Structures are given as C-alpha cells and as structure tokens.
C-alpha cells in the first residue's frame with residue numbers, strides 16, 4: 081500500500097526510488113503524465129518557489145538602493161508592476177527565457193532518458209559530492225515547503241496589503 | 252435481446268457494445284442505416300465542440316481579452332461585438348483544420364477509406380496521454396460522457412440565455428422566472 | 432441493403448487508392464501523428480517543435496518592445512524605427528522596418544515580453560459580486576426555489 | 585417499421601414530394617424571418 | 627450614381643412609400659382598433675416601412691420610376707445585387723448536380739439500376755448529399771483524373 | 787459477522803413483515819434482511835455500503851453538533867464572531883456568512899477527492915477494501931473486536947441518521963430539535 085495513504089494502493093508510476101516519493105498520488109496524475117516530466121516540473125516549481133519565498137522575506141527585511149526610489153516603496157506584486165513599468169522585470173524575463181530555452185532542451189533529454197529530472201550538473205562548490213540522495217531529499221522537502229510558504233505569503237499579501245514579516249508583526 | 256438503456260425496446264443490432272458509452276441506446280435505429288463509425292465521429296466532434304463551447308461561455312464571462320470589442324459578459328452579444336474579421340479568420344482556420352486533420356478525406360464516401368482511420372481518431376495526442384492501454388479505455392469513456400454532458404449543457408445555456416437575456420452565472424445569481 | 436456514410440469509396444463506386452499508407456506511431460508536439468518521410472520525426476520531432484517555440488518566444492521578447500530607445504534627453508525615450516532616414520535609396524528616405532512585420536501600435540495593442548502589456552491586459556471581472564447562494568441580497572435560483580416553496584397563494 | 589413500407593416511402597414520387605415540401609418550407613421560413621431580400625446585404 | 631440616383635434620396639421612392647402606406651391606412655380606417663384586421667394592416671404598414679427603409683440604406687439605385695434598379699456589370703459596389711447571389715446559386719446548383727451524378731453512378735453499379743432509380747437507396751443518397759459540399763474540388767479532381775469526361779470513341783453517336 | 791445468524795447474516799429479518807430478499811446474502815455487515823424494494827439486485831453492494839457508512843458517520847457528527855449548539859456550549863470566541871443564537875439554521879447561516887462553513891466545505895471536499903473517491907474507486911474495481919475503511923484507528927479501539935465495532939458503528943449511524951432528520955424537522959415545526 082501507499083506509505084502516506086495507508087488505505088490506498090501504491091501508485092504504479094511511483095516506484096519509490098525518486099527523492100520525496102512516499103506514494104502520495106491519490107488522484108493518479110502520474111498515471112496520466114510522464115513521471116519524468118512531472119519530476120522536472122516539481123523540481124522547477126520547488127526551486128522557483130524557494131527563491132520567491134526567500135526573496136519575499138529578504139525584500140521585507142531589506143531593499144536595494146534605487147529600487148526603492150523606482151518602486152515608490154511598493155511591495156510584492158505591486159513592486160512587480162512598478163518595475164515592469166520601469167523595465168527591470170523585462171530584463172529578468174529575458175534572461176530567464178534565455179535559460180529556459182536550454183531548459184527545454186534539457187527537458188527533452190530527460191524525456192529521452194539521458195538526463196535525470198532536474199539535474200543541470202550545477203554544483204560549483206561541490207556540496208553534492210558526499211550524499212547526493214540526502215541533499216536531493218532535502219532540496220525536494222524544502223521546495224515543497226517553500227511552495228506552500230510562497231502561496232501563504234502571496235495570499236496574505238492579497239488579504240492585507242502587508243508582506244510576510246510585516247503581517248506577522250501586525251496581523 | 253433487449254437494450255440496457257431502454258429495457259422494453261430490443262437491443263440495436265449494429266451496436267455491439269465495443270464502442271465506449273454503448274448502453275444500447277438507439278430507439279430510432281439510426282445505426283441501422285448510418286454507419287456507426289460515421290455516427291461516432293460526428294458524436295465525438297459535437298461533444299468536443301460543445302465541451303469547448305461550455306468552457307468558453309463560462310470563462311469569457313469572467314475573463315476577457317483586452318479591448319471594448321472583447322469586453323462582453325453576454326455570450327450572444329460577444330458573438331456580434333467581437334471583430335468580424337477575426338470571426339471570419341476563425342472560420343477559415345476551422346476549415347483548414349478540418350481539411351488537414353482529416354487528411355483530405357472529409358466526405359461520407361472517403362472519410363474512412365484507410366482501414367487505419369478509426370472513428371474520432373484524428374491523430375491528436377500532443378502530450379501522448381493516450382498511449383497507456385490501461386487508462387485508454389477509461390479516457391475514451393470519459394471523453395464520450397463529457398461530450399454528451401457538454402452538448403446538453405451548451406444547448407441549455409444557449410436557450411436559457413435566449414430567454415433570460417443575461418449570462419449563465421449572472422442568471423443563476425440573479426434569477427428571474429420567465430414572464431411572457 | 433446499404434449502410435450509408437461508410438466512408439469507403441468502393442462501397443459508393445467512387446475512385447480510391449488500392450494500397451493505403453500504414454499509420455506510424457510518432458507524435459510531434461504542435462504537430463500530428465500520421466505518415467511522414469523517413470527521418471522526419473527524428474529531424475522535426477517534439478524536441479524540434481518545442482525548442483523552436485522557445486527560441487521564437489525569446490525573439491518575440493525584443494520584437495514586442497521594438498523601437499529606438501535613447502537616453503540622450505536624460506530619460507528613456509522610445510521612437511519608432513520608421514523615423515530613422517536611410518541614405519542611398521532615392522525617394523524612399525524612410526523604409527520598412529520590423530514595425531512593418533509587427534504593427535502593434537497601429538492596432539492599439541501594448542505588447543510586452545509577455546504577450547499582454549499594461550494598457551492591453553487581460554480583464555478579470557468578478558461574477559459573484561456580493562451574491563450568495565442563499566439568503567443573500569441577490570435573488571439566486573436557490574432563493575427562487577425557496578421562496579416558491581414558502582409562497583402563499 | 586415494415587421494410588416494404590420503408591421501400592414505399594423511398595419510392596421516387598414520395599421522396600420528391602417530401603424533399604420539395606421541405607425545400608418550400610425552407611424558402612418560406614427564410615422569407616418569413618428575412619423578408620423582402622432583393623439583394624445580398626453588403 | 628452610375629446612371630441613376632441613390633434610392634435613399636429619391637422623391638419617387640418617397641412617393642411610392644407614401645402611396646403604399648396611405649393605401650394601407652385607408653384600408654385600416656374601416657376596422658376597429660385591436661381587431662385582427664386592424665392588427666394585420668398595422669403589421670403590413672410596419673413591414674412596408676421597414677422594407678423601404680432597408681432598401682434606402684442598402685445603397686440601391688433608383689430610376690425616375692421610383693423603383694430600385696440593379697447594376698449587374700461586375701462593379702464591386704453592386705456585387706450583392708447579382709454576383710454574390712449568383713455565387714450562392716452556383717454553389718447550390720453544383721452541389722445538386724454533383725450528388726445527382728454520384729448517385730447515378732452508384733445505381734449504375736448495382737444489381738438493378740432501374741430499381742435503384744425508381745425506389746431509391748436513401749442511405750446512399752444522403753451519403754452523396756453530404757458529400758456534395760466540396761463539389762468544386764471533387765469535380766475538378768474527377769476531371770483531372772479523367773473520370774468525368776468520356777472519350778469520343780466511347781459515346782454513341784448517330785450516323786452522318 | 788458478529789452474532790451471525792442472530793444479529794446479522796442469512797436468515798435474519800429485523801422486520802418479518804417483509805421477506806428477506808434473496809439478494810441479501812448475509813455477507814455484508816448490517817445485513818438484517820431489510821430490502822423490500824430489492825435494490826440489492828441491481829445496485830453495487832460495495833458502493834451502497836460505503837454510502838451507508840458515510841451517511842451514518844456524518845449523521846452522528848451532525849447529531850453531536852446540533853445538540854451542543856442547542857445546549858449552548860460554544861468554543862471560546864465562537865459567540866463573539868458568529869453570535870449567541872441557539873437555532874441551528876441561524877447558526878448555519880451566520881457561519882456561512884462569516885466563512886466557517888465555506889472552509890469546512892473546502893476541506894471536506896479535499897478529503898473526499900483525495901481519500902474517499904480513490905478509495906471508493908479502488909474498492910469497486912476490486913481492491914478488497916472493507917466499505918468505510920480508511921485506516922483511521924489512532925487509539926486502537928477496534929483491534930479487540932473489529933466486526934463487533936463495525937456492526938455497532940452501522941447501527942449507531944442509522945439511528946443517528948433518523949435522529950438528525952427528526953431533530954431538523956422538529957426545529958422546523960416547533961423551533962426545538964427535541965420537538966418534545
């Protein structure tokens with residue numbers, strides 16, 4: 081049976097080797113879509129959401145000089161809009177798209193079985209040379225937590241007009 | 252010997268139960284005189300178009316493309332307000348899509364000339380979700396039932412909009428019974 | 432008898448081929464599954480389609496905001512490429528440019544790296560407003576049913 | 585339905601009458617809802 | 627404008643409208659208000675007025691007689707008068723002819739072609755009726771494949 | 787089955803007025819030979835048993851809730867936000883207004899979609915799961931006599947269904963759920 085959902089049978093497309101695989105797929109999306117594609121998507125969302133949550137917290141804590149002048153003190157998505165008008169978000173999107181072209185190439189090498197999902201071979205400091213499985217589990221767990229956290233932060237901002245830390249301070 | 256859907260009527264002879272969604276429902280016996288392959292192709296096309304139609308009627312009431320031309324919560328009004336050149340472009344594109352997808356075999360005399368051609372199978376599987384035999388039958392049944400439900404829903408939506416002269420969601424939220 | 436709409440021309444005495452092409456099982460995203468020349472799927476497969484689409488989007492990003500940007504005046508000013516005058520082409524001092532291929536401004540569309548821009552943005556209209564399924568200011572379908580059930584002749 | 589009765593309905597005069605009545609109804613309803621169309625509107 | 631005046635600004639057209647409406651109103655004056663005859667005559671008046679207004683706005687040209695005239699020379703400003711209607715006809719007529727020819731050949735290759743021609747095989751007839759919607763490309767395909775035109779040596783002819 | 791042949795199983799009829807239908811084979815818990823309309827002939831037994839257990843559980847929780855509402859026991863802070871009304875219908879409307887019932891609906895639906903629907907589908911496809919089983923025995927109260935607990939649960943749920951219905955209608959008539 082499924083370790084996470086004891087009363088449900090283990091999802092077939094989930095063999096359990098992958099990091100963060102606890103047999104959690106009650107709706108069976110893995111039976112619909114290729115599990116390699118799903119793993120790539122999960123790791124992408126993980127990394128983007130971790131960066132987004134850390135950026136939310138770090139923007140509450142500190143703001144670079146000049147950006148405050150351009151955004152007029154706006155926060156979160158209001159800052160997104162102001163800096164879209166400025167032109168910064170355009171530069172971010174251009175370079176992220178430049179990265180994502182090779183991301184598409186890497187996605188198709190994953191789908192061809194040549195590349196592990198999410199493996200860009202980026203480890204300059206060599207942190208992932210002692211137990212890669214442990215670091216992968218840590219990455220996946222932190223990414224899921226960060227997806228939930230960024231959801232919470234963005235929707236708290238929609239509710240209140242306040243950032244994460246500012247909300248926790250007032251509330 | 253008797254149809255499952257309508258017990259008192261006999262089972263339609265041409266409906267052997269192979270096709271998904273087959274419950275022996277053919278009281279008027281269309282399948283006797285019209286090939287079930289053609290009928291199923293037509294059924295799937297209608298169901299797909301009505302799936303998209305229901306989704307569009309429900310979605311373009313809340314989310315619209317920028318512009319006064321596209322700003323219309325009422326769908327029958329959107330039909331007229333949307334740019335006429337754009338609508339004609341959509342018509343031409345639908346024609347080209349029919350031609351290419353059916354591979355120049357678009358008539359009752361040549362549609363299924365190729366034995367490989369199966370009813371409703373136009374080679375459309377961009378993400379290859381239908382390559383799994385285990386889930387293929389379930390997906391086929393789901394597609395047929397969705398097409399049927401969407402056909403009924405689209406018909407009801409169109410005529411309730413004719414009556415109420417208000418969008419579907421707007422009608423359900425501000426209902427006003429019919430008076431003359 | 433004859434079953435109509437067979438789709439087989441031989442049944443209706445219409446011209447048809449004698450050997451029909453077999454159906455291979457290869458798919459190209461943004462393409463179709465069907466007979467193709469050899470190596471067609473390998474050369475122009477889903478990888479080709481997707482990576483070409485990504486390159487097209489990356490090239491769209493400059494095109495959408497195409498225009499001569501200058502900071503000579505002290506502020507970023509955008510000027511249409513059509514303004515620039517080109518020597519050596521006789522009467523045609525002003526010549527076609529990328530705006531000819533992409534006339535966003537003529538149609539009043541504010542393009543952006545992402546398709547839509549601030550001036551031309553997707554419009555989200557909340558349908559609910561201040562309505563509730565029951566016992567609300569708006570008279571819903573459920574409210575109508577309830578009122579009819581509690582009605583007095 | 586009886587196959588012989590269906591063949592009798594398929595006979596030429598019955599089919600001609602039904603088809604031309606259907607066509608007459610089509611034209612009549614077209615003129616009823618869109619009357620006095622002396623031209624294609626452009 | 628070609629040789630006539632626009633019908634929207636023609637005194638003759640206005641006079642014809644006035645005469646028709648006055649005839650209808652004279653007929654209506656002898657019927658009680660709200661009675662079926664009065665309602666019918668009022669609807670006739672409304673239909674006449676709508677017809678005249680639509681003809682005026684259509685851009686039709688009207689002569690000294692006060693009646694619209696058609697410019698069937700090819701001018702694109704008056705395509706809707708003859709050409710586009712003519713195209714619709716040609717479409718429908720070619721549809722009919724193509725499906726009829728297809729059914730003729732189908733019955734020719736049957737056990738009893740004459741029986742198929744007097745007592746029709748309406749499933750196949752409806753099949754051909756459906757096929758008739760791309761008759762232009764189908765007919766040209768037949769012509770180029772050589773299945774349309776018969777050879778001179780294969781058609782019976784009387785002696786000279 | 788606990789007390790097979792006496793409390794439940796083949797040859798048991800709670801109401802001898804109606805004959806024990808042959809479809810009731812005594813294999814299902816709570817089978818006391820009551821099915822006068824013979825639904826068991828055509829219905830899916832596992833699906834209907836799961837539905838019965840779900841209805842009973844919801845009715846038991848609803849009886850407890852309505853009772854605590856009428857008795858006036860409220861959680862700290864509930865009265866300030868919702869109100870001091872003891873009427874069940876007024877409480878329901880107030881909670882819907884505030885947003886409580888909306889959140890309960892969201893989470894109940896999430897649990898349904900992720901647990902009950904997959905579990906029900908697998909059971910009907912032949913997973914062998916006992917109807918109404920989710921593995922929710924944190925306190926381990928059912929390990930001693932699981933069959934006895936099952937029969938007791940089913941009977942208590944049926945009684946709670948009837949009681950909750952009666953209480954709602956009594957509140958409608960007299961304004962009191964006791965309907966004394």
Ligand code: CLA
Pocket residue numbers: 708711712713715716719720722723724
């Ligand atoms: C409401 C108006 C109206 C009405 C009632 C009719 C009625 C008629 N038309 Mg039509 N016609 C109309 C408007 C109308 N026409 C207009 C506006 C045009 C101008 C385009 C024409 C042009 C036209 C032609 C060119 C012909 C007719 C013919 C006919 C008669 C026989 C049609 C037939 O058998 O079809 C059933 C169809 C068939 C039997 C198949 C073969 C015949 C069709 C017409 C061929 C169509 C495709 C072909 C490639 C066109 C080539 C044309 C070229 C040689 C000029 C019928 C009385 C035919 C006639 O009088 O024949 C003696 C005929 O040949 N009409």
Ligand code: CLA
Pocket residue numbers: 833836837838840841844891894895896898899902903906
């Ligand atoms: C809102 C989410 C939700 C969902 C997804 C379900 C799902 C289910 N409930 Mg329900 N249920 C819910 C909330 C929900 N429940 C709540 C809040 C309560 C009260 C606390 C109950 C109380 C309850 C009881 C007492 C019973 C069920 C039963 C069922 C099952 C049979 C119904 C079914 O399959 O319909 C699916 C639909 C069809 C088969 C065809 C009709 C299609 C309709 C018209 C559209 C459905 C729309 C959908 C529900 C909207 C939400 C979509 C969203 C999740 C994406 C199924 C697992 C019965 C069962 O057999 O359980 C095992 C049963 O006995 N439920």
Ligand SMILES: CC1=C(C#C/C(C)=C/C=C/C(C)=C/C=C/C=C(C)/C=C/C=C(\C)C#CC2=C(C)C[C@@H](O)CC2(C)C)C(C)(C)C[C@H](O)C1
Pocket residue numbers: 129130131133134202203204205206207208222223225226228229230231232233236243244245247248
């Ligand atoms: C790749 C690589 C490297 C690297 C690297 C890098 C750059 C790694 C960066 C990692 C980062 C930024 C990780 C961020 C994780 C954030 C989380 C888990 C947030 C959770 C938020 C939560 C739970 C929340 C919340 C909240 C909510 C919901 C709402 C709020 O009102 C309240 C609250 C705040 C509580 C290096 C350079 C080392 C090289 C190496 O060779 C390999």
Ligand SMILES: CC1=C(C#C/C(C)=C/C=C/C(C)=C/C=C/C=C(C)/C=C/C=C(\C)C#CC2=C(C)C[C@@H](O)CC2(C)C)C(C)(C)C[C@H](O)C1
Pocket residue numbers: 301302303305306375376377378379380381397398400401403404405406407408411419423
């Ligand atoms: C196939 C495929 C793909 C795909 C795909 C896609 C895009 C699939 C899209 C599917 C869609 C849009 C399905 C929509 C179904 C709608 C239904 C059943 C509506 C019913 C309405 C009813 C009953 C009603 C009603 C009503 C009426 C009338 C009266 C009202 O008062 C009330 C109400 C509103 C309730 C992708 C692209 C992923 C690729 C893949 O490789 C292959």
Ligand SMILES: CCCCCCCCCCCCO[C@H]1O[C@H](CO)[C@@H](O[C@H]2O[C@H](CO)[C@@H](O)[C@H](O)[C@H]2O)[C@H](O)[C@H]1O
Pocket residue numbers: 335336337538
């Ligand atoms: C990209 C190059 C492709 C070359 C092949 C094109 C072949 C056929 C082109 C036909 C002309 C385009 O059709 C066009 O006519 C309509 C007439 O109402 C236009 O209608 C509208 O167009 C403009 C906005 O786009 C508006 O500024 C116009 O005022 C408005 O009339 C539509 O823009 C378009 O539908």
